[PDB]
Amino acid sequence: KLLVTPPKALLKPLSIPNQLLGPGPSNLPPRIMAAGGLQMIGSMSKDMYQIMDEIKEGIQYVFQTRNPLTLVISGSGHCALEAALVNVLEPGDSFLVGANGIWGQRAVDIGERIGARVHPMTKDPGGHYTLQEVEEGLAQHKPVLLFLTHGESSTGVLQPLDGFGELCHRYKCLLLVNSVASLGGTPLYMDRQGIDILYSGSQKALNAPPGTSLISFSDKAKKKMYSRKTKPFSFYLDIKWLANFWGCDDQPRMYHHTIPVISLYSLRESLALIAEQGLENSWRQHREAAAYLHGRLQALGLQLFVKDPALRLPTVTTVAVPAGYDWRDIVSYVIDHFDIEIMGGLGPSTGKVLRIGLLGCNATRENVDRVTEALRAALQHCPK
Amino acid sequence: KLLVTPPKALLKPLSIPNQLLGPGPSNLPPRIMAAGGLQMIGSMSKDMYQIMDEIKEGIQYVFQTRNPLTLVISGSGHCALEAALVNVLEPGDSFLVGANGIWGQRAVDIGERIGARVHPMTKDPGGHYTLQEVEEGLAQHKPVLLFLTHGESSTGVLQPLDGFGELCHRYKCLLLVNSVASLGGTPLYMDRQGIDILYSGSQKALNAPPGTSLISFSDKAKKKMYSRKTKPFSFYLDIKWLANFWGCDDQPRMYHHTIPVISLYSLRESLALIAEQGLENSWRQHREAAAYLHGRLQALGLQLFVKDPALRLPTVTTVAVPAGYDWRDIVSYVIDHFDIEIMGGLGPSTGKVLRIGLLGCNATRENVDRVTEALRAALQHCPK
Ligand SMILES: *Cc1c(COP(=O)(O)O)cnc(C)c1O
Ligand SMILES: *Cc1c(COP(=O)(O)O)cnc(C)c1O
């Protein structure tokens, strides 16, 4: 006899609330939900390949690149990061990291884990990196790779990018940029800013379900990875394998792992939506919304964490915890009474901030309202 | 001006054929497709946690275990493998591997990559492992971990399991079993067979979309992993992190990575279906079908790769390439003329075999027919 019996809770039907305006993930639009409900096809079929090919073109379009080594990572944001680090870095190599919030911190941990030379340019939450703080580190530590967070979703900071690609190439270094938060909602041009490795997530402004990520590599990166003398520590993430499967190199596509088919359908659609909308219209939408939101938020009497408006990330706003409140009470209130998700801090910003998120189709004046009135109420009833 | 323009192909609407009876993935039933079409919820919400908790109970039920360290890996079959290896093996450690087809071979590559002592018990395609070939290796190489493929989908072989858990524990070793193919479609009892690490995939007999996997750890494994002195090479796959998030350990759930929400909805449902159906009824269904199929296949005049019926994997049948044919012609024919996917070999079995798959709700007499008549036709028209 079987000792473990059919779980009582599973024999009920699944049902989910109706809720998201935090740092992510974001709500899905009809078209993407529709894609997610479709039947499976052969995971190595002519049809599946065509879908992948369209996804690649879409990643080129949203990154603004023509890099032939552009493909989807079967896994979340951290997965894409770990993939870029584990294929570009042979143990010991020098690694320069912009540690201005949790997303540098994580790149640190990953770098350390794979045995790299880890030099963390540490900076309080709110801070960003000047060309000179960059040169200072490029000079003192002479790294083969630098990591910068573009949209720092844990501190609400937009990192300036122009010119750093070039600063890296003078010091022979490679530029890796995390655009999970920013991609789709602020200007970003891979080739025109000399970024070597650019990655993003499906779940932020693209409004896809979490679990896929986008990645692209320049030919300087492609060269470093293909002329490695060690094998990378992960098979799942071995780029030479992935590239082949994704049609990037010359050979016929050889099975590696099984791609998340139904998530790909979703991703494709999220790309078609933003391809139809167009990037500059997207960046406008996000910019305007962020401004509207900032205005209403100061109207409630709150103080924005990032003082300088040019340094604010449109997709994710940080707001200082108003004195005399418990941030958890406010957050609780908003979901408990209005069915709306916002978030507190994260990593360094923990307990310092509240975070509010405008991502893709969910970055509207309408939603800003809803969240404004939710915060009003919480400020009236959450104990002071 | 933006140099990369909106991709022409994306601005058309997505559409997919209607097709799957290969080694996997498998077709989805309505209920799972429905789940895949649902809206997002907060990825760290009380509701999301409850769903995860039900998924855990379901993994306990299908593995037959009460191991509190049981959870879902955000990633495919290889991801789950790499996760078990990267958390259980400190560099150098001795690693005994059942290399009887591609799935041992991959565990080899992964083991080598993370710097383990890799001893591959190599065996031609079709072969399985006796308790004595196991003891011989346990004795000569004295490993801390042994890997066995349960359902060898690349050779159609069901590996016997009874007693090997115990053989391992006498040599102090840990038993890791790959049940991606077999889980749901043949008998398997984690605790009653003394397996230390058991993993499976969402996409085989559970009929979920590819991109999630199941994993469970015994307390001997849990102890080895938690008392490591090196950190594991992957952050994404660090078990101490995952365990916490998945509610396994004592602490409140701390954000690690973002779980594939919508895939989880799907997984939950695939588990509820088999929980309602019950395992022994599932194993019956699969067993019967496999027998029906074997009969019809010899009727067409074909010769089954695995001679001994007790060693045949119900979920995946291997059939010898009939002399004078091009296996690619046959496979092509079947999809091209009937909208049915089957597969050729893989790894060692490449070009030797054809593979036919009966997985979950798609393991029916009905589908066996359809594929039988497809093969008939291909044998009449595919050039000899
Ligand atoms: C959301 C986000 C991440 C997290 O990605 P996961 O899906 O949690 O792996 C990382 N970096 C940035 C900038 C983000 O906005
Ligand atoms: C399908 C299958 C795999 C492959 O899993 P991926 O999703 O390709 O990572 C591995 N092992 C076995 C036994 C299988 O049946």
Residue numbers in the entry:
A (entry chain A), B (entry chain A): 5 to 23, 25 to 389
Quote the original article.
AGT is a hepatocyte-specific PLP dependent enzyme, belonging to the Fold Type I family, catalysing the transamination reaction between L-alanine and glyoxylate to produce glycine and pyruvate, thus leading to the removal of glyoxylate. AGT normally localises in the peroxisomes and failure of its detoxification role leads to increased levels of oxalate, coming from oxidation of glyoxylate, causing calcium oxalate precipitation in the kidney and urinary tract. Many pathogenic variants of AGT cause PH1 (primary hyperoxaluria type I), a rare autosomal recessive disorder. Our results shows that two forces generated by the salt bridge between the conserved aspartate residue and the pyridine N1 atom, and by the Schiff base linkage act as opposite springs and are responsible for the fine tilting adjustments of the pyridine plane of PLP.
D183N is a pathogenic variant of AGT that causes Primary Hyperoxaluria Type I (PH1), a severe disorder of glyoxylate metabolism. Although the mutation is conservative, the variant shows a 2.3 × 104 fold reduction of the catalytic efficiency, whereas the affinity for PLP is almost unchanged. By coupling this result with the crystal structure at different pH of the AGT pathogenic variant D183N, bearing the mutation of the conserved aspartate, and with a molecular dynamic simulation of the transaldimination step, we propose a novel interpretation of the conserved aspartate role. While the wild type enzyme at pH > 7.5 shows spectral changes, which can be interpreted as deprotonation of the internal aldimine, in the mutant the internal aldimine is protonated over a wide range of pH values (5.0–9.2). This effect is also a consequence of the strain relaxation, which increases the stability of the protonated species. The strain release of the D183N mutant is also likely responsible for the slight increase in thermal stability observed for this variant, and for its apparent resistance towards radiation damage, given that the internal aldimine of the mutant seems not to undergo x-ray induced-reduction both at acidic and alkaline pH.
